[PDB]
């Protein structure tokens, strides 16, 4: 009867392309209780307000979280020709969403750091003719096709991965490359919230 945000506080948050997604229905939420544990650096919403999203009732609430460096805050905007929205994470444009970038304080010890931040800088299909490239843009609310050939954390900027497709799948290869970003003293996370209005059991407290 209370929406459990606890999982977020345990472990290494995944890199952006492997964002963890908590779906909530029929439960009550205290969003400030969660956010008050971090040092929130940004809190931006689309078609809802920070005050409104903290206090409305929805048919479902969806919370994505990942490791994300504050320095790249700009890349995390729908209007960026950049790789973060092309091949990693892209938020719904048919539902209200908020985007929170936060820094993990020192008493928050159950969140751990990966060795670096990393993301996908290319996820393309190589056709069975072995010459033409077809970028696999990520879709809102989905994972990049390439998430299964890209490691949990990239090891070196520029690493290159590839998977061959069966002939049923059209042959050729699925092909990707990753970028890396120097870790920060304290982990920096992004939280993606997207709410759905339908009949609305997900309510505040």
């Amino acid at each position, epitope marked *: 009867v209370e929406c459990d945000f606890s999982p977020l506080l345990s472990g290494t948050p995944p890199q952006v392309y492997n964002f963890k997604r908590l779906v909530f229905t029929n439960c009550n939420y205290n969003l400030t209780k969660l956010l008050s544990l971090f040092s929130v650096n940004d809190f931006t919403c689309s078609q809802i307000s920070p005050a409104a999203i903290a206090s409305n009732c929805y048919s479902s609430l969806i919370l994505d979280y990942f490791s994300y460096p504050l320095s790249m805050k700009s890349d995390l905007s729908v209007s960026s020709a950049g790789p973060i929205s092309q091949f990693n994470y892209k938020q719904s444009f048919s539902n209200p969403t908020c985007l929170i970038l936060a820094t993990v304080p020192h008493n928050l010890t159950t969140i751990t750091k990966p060795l670096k931040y990393s993301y996908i800088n*290319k996820c393309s299909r190589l056709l069975s003719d072995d010459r033409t490239e077809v970028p696999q843009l990520v879709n809102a609310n989905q994972y990049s096709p390439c998430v299964s*050939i890209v490691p949990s954390t990239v090891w070196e900027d520029g690493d*290159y*991965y*590839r998977k061959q497709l069966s002939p049923l799948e059209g042959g050729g290869w699925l092909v990707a490359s990753g970028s890396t970003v120097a870790m920060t003293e304290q982990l920096q996370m992004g939280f993606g919230i997207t709410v759905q209005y339908g009949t609305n059991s997900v309510c505040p407290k």
Partner: antibody
Amino acid sequence: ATRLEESGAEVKKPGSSVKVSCKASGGTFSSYAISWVRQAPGQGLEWMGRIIPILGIANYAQKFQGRVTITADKSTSTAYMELSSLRSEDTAVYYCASKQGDYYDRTSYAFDIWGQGTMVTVSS
Amino acid sequence: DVELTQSPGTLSLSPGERATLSCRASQSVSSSYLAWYQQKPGQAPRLLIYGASSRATGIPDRFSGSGSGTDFTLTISRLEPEDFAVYYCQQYGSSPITFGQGTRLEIKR
């Protein structure tokens, strides 16, 4: 399966430049991560750079950041290595090398596809 | 670069015995990023092991790798006559990729 055929041995005068070639056959080409490793007689192995044809551009070791130029022609299924300003210690067998199958993590830097080699001699 | 120092420079053993080849590293190397090659006179090297647990296809299961941190090991369960060659380790977690000096394996007559 997929194989790498290199260009014949070749003699070069100190100070000149050599272009060793490496042609692939038996499969495809553009997805491969093709390295160049060289080896001096009686000596161990030395990695020089690598190119992935669709990724466009090569990447080199700092030592050979002059100097060496790795390129690929996706129509010849051929990659090349070029090495300027030769020298009596730059004489060695020059191996063309790659990985087979799918590439996860750093596994394309382990080499289970090798060419026959190319002995490049520098002498007056 | 990272310096990989193999030992002994030459190993003397008879067929049927157990070989232990060492590879020591100047820095720590993740065992995800260490491989071992076999080379025979006049031939390209051939991939054997690329740890932490992979083994190259078509490679005898009597080669296995172990070790972590700084000291790594290529074990050869039972030597067959064709296993007598030069062995090289390789690290590929740090740039640039470095190889080792070589251990030579020869028959103890």
